[PDB]
Every structure is written in structure tokens, then in C-alpha cells.
Design a binder for this molecule. Structure first.
Ligand code: NA
Ligand SMILES: [Zn+2]
Length: 274
């Protein structure tokens, strides 16, 4: 019930073949620059060998939000259903940039969401219990439907010590469910402002970048991926929030919402800040 024309029962294995009225529903899900992928750290190439795309200048994302040129996601809201999407007022200053096809472009964070219980990307063949995707869109694109996107992927490994931001989100949500001001399935539920640098970015800026796609249909190949290789931490107790919210919203929802890894094909993956 959460997604419309597809689900995660086969982790997307079925997506490229779905047809309706003898017409293929998601032709781009069969492309050759699909995401997610495995990140083999011993095979990462040097950034200068990547044609057409530079490292991201994190700018305001990597400056304490309390600072003048630090970004704070404001008027933040979370959807109480699978993926727990968080939306907020569009940042307009200190935007991160990426030089693409020779042009430096600014990127605007538009939402962030989660892939819970199994990560979409793997690092050296290993999955993480949680992967956060901060989705950014190039500023003023020609058409929003075909806009260049940049996504930041952040992993969380199981640990005996949970993450601070996840704790706050869990506390806020569990509190609103408890006092009746929010119900599972509600969308755009208010939550506290978020300090990108202190609450979301991991402890090291090391990341793997490559050319990829959306990991949900239509799988459009318009994403510059930045997968940070140092994980944050999460406890099984914090992971319970995702099940409660996901099944509380739709009894038929898939609690493990990861698309399977895809063929790298002729792409290389590059290492940044190593
Ligand atoms: Na600030
Ligand atoms: Zn995602």
C-alpha cells in the first residue's frame, strides 16, 4: 500500500519486467547505470580520472548549522510510513556545488529518507541495517522532471550505542503517537529543526562517488551518488521505530525496503577525501 505500482517483495528483481497493457511500465529500470551497487573500496579510482563530474563541495552541509554558513533544515516534517521521508523548507544559502559537464552547479536538498533493515548499497559486500538518502536537486533546472540530482548516502552499523538524531526522532514520534497528536500513516508531521553537519553527516568525509540512478521506479539515470564509507551507529531498539511506523501505516507494507544491487557495467567508482 505505501508505493503505488511496485513493492519490495523481490527487492526490485521484478521491476524491469512489469508490464500493463502489453506496455513496459518501467523501461529505465533496465538501464546500464543503475543504483544501488556494491562499493569495493580496493577498486576505487582517483577523482581526477572521473570524466564529467567533480567532487562535491559540501559547503553549508558540512558547517555546524549554528554557524552563519552552516545549514539547518527548518520547518522539518516526517511522513509516518515506510521510508520515513523528512521534508523541510528549501535551503537557499551556502548550497553544496558539483561541477558537471564543465559547469559548476548548486544543489538544493529537497528531502531525506531511509532504507531500513537492509541497506541498498553494500561496502565490500556487507549490508548495514540502515541507509539514509539526502536527495538534492540542481538549482533552477531546465525541467524539474529531468533535473540533475545529487544524493548523499549515509550508513548506520549496529552498535551498543545508538545515534543521537535517531534517538531524538524516535522520542519525538513515540511521544506524538502517545499523546494522540499524530497517528501512523500521517504525513508531514512536525519535528524539530535539524543541524545537517552535527546530526546527519558522519564523522569522516570519506566517500565513494559514481554515476547512477534513482533506486525506486522509474529508476531514472540522473543521480550523482556520494556514498560515505564511515558509518553512524544504531541499536536494535532504535530500529524498532521503523517497523512500528511502517506496519502501523500499512499492514501490507514491506518493512525491508531496499532495491537489490545492480551491475556496475562499464562504470568505475571514485574515492573522495581519502
Ligand atoms: Na546556520
Ligand atoms: Zn533512497
Amino acid at each position: 500500500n505505501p508505493n503505488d505500482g511496485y513493492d519490495y517483495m523481490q527487492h526490485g528483481f521484478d521491476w524491469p519486467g512489469l508490464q500493463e497493457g502489453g506496455t513496459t511500465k518501467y523501461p529505465a529500470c533496465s538501464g546500464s547505470n543503475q543504483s544501488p551497487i556494491d562499493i569495493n573500496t580496493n577498486q576505487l579510482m582517483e577523482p581526477s580520472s572521473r570524466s564529467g563530474t567533480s567532487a562535491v563541495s559540501l559547503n553549508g552541509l558540512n558547517v555546524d548549522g549554528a554557524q552563519a554558513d552552516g545549514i539547518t533544515l527548518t520547518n522539518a516534517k516526517v511522513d509516518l510510513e515506510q521510508g520515513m521521508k523528512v521534508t523541510f523548507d528549501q535551503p537557499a544559502a551556502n548550497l553544496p556545488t558539483i561541477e558537471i559537464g564543465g559547469t559548476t552547479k548548486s544543489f538544493v536538498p529537497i528531502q531525506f529518507h531511509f532504507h531500513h533493515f537492509l541497506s541498498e548499497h553494500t561496502i565490500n559486500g556487507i549490508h548495514y541495517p540502515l541507509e539514509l538518502h539526502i536527495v538534492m536537486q540542481e538549482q533552477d533546472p531546465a525541467d524539474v522532471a529531468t533535473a540533475q540530482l545529487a544524493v548523499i548516502g549515509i550508513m548506520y552499523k549496529y552498535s551498543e550505542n545508538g545515534d543521537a538524531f535517531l534517538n531524538s526522532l524516535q522520542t519525538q514520534i513515540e511521544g506524538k503517537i502517545g499523546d494522540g497528536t499524530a497517528s501512523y500513516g500521517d504525513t508531514g508531521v512536525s519535528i524539530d529543526n535539524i543541524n545537517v553537519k552535527t546530526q546527519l553527516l558522519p564523522s569522516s568525509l570519506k566517500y565513494a562517488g559514481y554515476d547512477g540512478s534513482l533506486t525506486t521506479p522509474g529508476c531514472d539515470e540522473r543521480v550523482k551518488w556520494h556514498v560515505f564509507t564511515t558509518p553512524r551507529e544504531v541499536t536494535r531498539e532504535q530500529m524498532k521505530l521503523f517497523v512500528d511506523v511502517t506496519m502501523g501505516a500499512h499492514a501490507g507494507a514491506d518493512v525491508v525496503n531496499n532495491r537489490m544491487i545492480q551491475d556496475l557495467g562499464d562504470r568505475e567508482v571514485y574515492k573522495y577525501n581519502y
